[PDB]
Amino acid sequence: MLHEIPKSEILKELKRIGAKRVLIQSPEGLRREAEELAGFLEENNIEVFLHGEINYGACDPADREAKLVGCDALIHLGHSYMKLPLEVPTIFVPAFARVSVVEALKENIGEIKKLGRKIIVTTTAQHIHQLKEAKEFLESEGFEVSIGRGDSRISWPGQVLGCNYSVAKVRGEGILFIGSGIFHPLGLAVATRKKVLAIDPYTKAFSWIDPERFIRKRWAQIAKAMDAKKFGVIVSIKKGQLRLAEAKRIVKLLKKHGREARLIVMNDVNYHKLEGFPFEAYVVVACPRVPLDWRKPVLTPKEVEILLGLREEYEFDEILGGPRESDEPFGISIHST
C-alpha cells in the first residue's frame, strides 16, 4: 500500500503549462492507478493516452513516444527525476510506501549496533520520505548517521538505485540498507567493500550480506566466456541507458585482444531476441540488472575487463552521473528541455 497520487496537484500543473493531451507511463504496480488518473484528467478536459509498455525506471522516459503521438506533456508515475534531456514537459510522480521503517529498525537495533557507531544509511525511493525519521531514530540510539548526496542519476540524498550507489560512497564503519530484495544490498556490498546489513521494512527481517556466493557465480560466468571468440556488445536506446562510447570501446578492446566483436542496438534488452545470432558470449552495456540479476555468458563491461585480464578485482557495474546541484522534492516535480 502506497500513499495516494496527487491528482489535483498534477492537474493544476498541466493547466499551468497548458496541456491538452498527455501520455501516462506507469510501472507494474501502478497500472490500475494510471487508468484512474487518466479517467480523472479526462473529466477535466484533457485527452489521455496510456503508455502500454511496462516502465522500469526514470532512466526510460517515454518523451519520444509522447512526441510521436502528439502529446503536449508526459506524466511519469512511480519514479523521481534523474538528469536527462526531455522532449516534452514531464511531471514525475514518485511513489511512497506507507510501511513504517522505524518499526523495522526498533525490532533490529541489536543487529544494527553490530554494524558500528558511525554508519552509512541508504534506502530506495519508496522509503525516502521516511529517511529523516530513520536518521533521528538511529541518532537517538547512539549512532552517527552518514548520508551521502549522490550524483545526477540520484534524486535524493541517501537514495540508491540498482545501477547507482553514489550516496553510499562516504565514510563509515558499515552500511545500513532499508528496503526489500537482495540486489541493492548486494551492489552496495560489492561497490563499497564495507559490511552491509539489509533490513526489510515489510517483514522486519534482517540480512547480513555476503557477496562471496554472488562473485563466485559471476566468475563462473567469466570463465565460460574465456573460451569465446565471438562477442555481441549490447546497448539500449532508452535515454538514461544509452552508453554508446563505452560500448564502442568494449568492441575496440575485444578486437585488440583477438576477439571478434559486434555492437548490437536494442531497446528492451532481452536475451530471447538474440538467440539466432552467432555470438558465443555477450556484454551488456546498459542497465546492469540485466547481466547481474541466458544460454550464453552475458557480462558487464567490468567483467569483460576481468576476462581480458585488464582488471583484477571484481567490480559492480554502475551508471554514474556528474555532480548534482539541487535535490528533488518529496512530491511531484515538473521538468522540461
Binding site per annotation, positions for [4Fe-4S] cluster? 59, 163, 287
C-alpha cell at 42: 479526462
- CA atoms of 88 and 29, how far apart (whole Å): 25
Contacts with 289 (C-beta within 8 Å, 6 or more apart), sequence order: 162, 163, 183
Q: Closest approach of Cβ 163 to its own copies, in Å?
A: 20
Phi, psi for 100 (deg, rounded to 5): -85, 115
Confirm or reject binding of residue 85 to its own copies (CB under 8 A): no
Q: How far is CA 89 from CA 39, 69, 80, 85, in A?
A: 20, 14, 14, 10
Confirm or reject binding of residue 228 to its own copies (CB under 8 A): no
Candidate residues 21, 27, 35, 56; the one interacting with ligand SF4 per rule CB under 6 A: 56
| Interface segment toward its own copies; rule CB under 8 A; list 10-18, 134-142, 201-209, 255-263 | 255-263
* Beta bridge pairs of residue 266: 236
Candidate residues 77, 161, 235, 306; the one interacting with its own copies per rule CB under 8 A: 235
**Would you put residue 49 in left (φ > 0), alpha (ψ -120 to 50) or beta?**
beta
Is residue 123 helix, strand or coil? strand
User: 237 touches which of its own copies, ligand SF4, none (CB within 5 to 8 A by kind)?
Assistant: its own copies
Smaller CB separation from ligand SF4, 107 or 268:
268
Binding-site residue total for its own copies (CB under 8 A)? 41
User: 199 touches which of ligand SF4, its own copies, none (CB within 5 to 8 A by kind)?
Assistant: none
Confirm or reject binding of residue 74 to its own copies (CB under 8 A): no
Confirm or reject binding of residue 95 to ligand SF4 (CB under 6 A): no
- Cα 88–Cα 94–Cα 97 angle in degrees, nearest 5: 165
Q: Closest approach of Cβ 281 to its own copies, in Å?
A: 14
- Cα 170–Cα 174–Cα 175 angle in degrees, nearest 5: 75
- Report yes or no: 122 and 160 within 8 Å, Cβ to Cβ: yes
User: 65 touches which of its own copies, ligand SF4, none (CB within 5 to 8 A by kind)?
Assistant: its own copies
Task: Please name the residue that has the C-alpha cell 540508491.
Answer: 160
Q: Closest approach of Cβ 7 to ligand SF4, in Å?
A: 25
- Report yes or no: 222 and 300 within 8 Å, Cβ to Cβ: no
Confirm or reject binding of residue 183 to ligand SF4 (CB under 6 A): no
**Strand-pair category, 21-25 with 196-199:** unpaired
Phi, psi for 265 (deg, rounded to 5): -105, 125
User: 59 touches which of ligand SF4, its own copies, none (CB within 5 to 8 A by kind)?
Assistant: ligand SF4
Candidate residues 157, 289, 314, 331; the one interacting with ligand SF4 per rule CB under 6 A: 289
- Cα 41–Cα 45–Cα 50 angle in degrees, nearest 5: 45
Q: Closest approach of Cβ 143 to ligand SF4, in Å?
A: 28
Residue 330 has a CB neighbour count (10 Å cut-off) of 15
Confirm or reject binding of residue 263 to its own copies (CB under 8 A): yes
Confirm or reject binding of residue 99 to its own copies (CB under 8 A): no
By CB under 8 A, name the binding residues for its own copies: 23, 28-29, 31-32, 34-35, 38-39, 48-54, 62, 65, 68-70, 232, 234-235, 237, 242, 244, 260, 262-267, 269, 273-274, 276-279
By CB under 6 A, name the binding residues for ligand SF4: 56-57, 59, 161-163, 241, 287, 289, 319
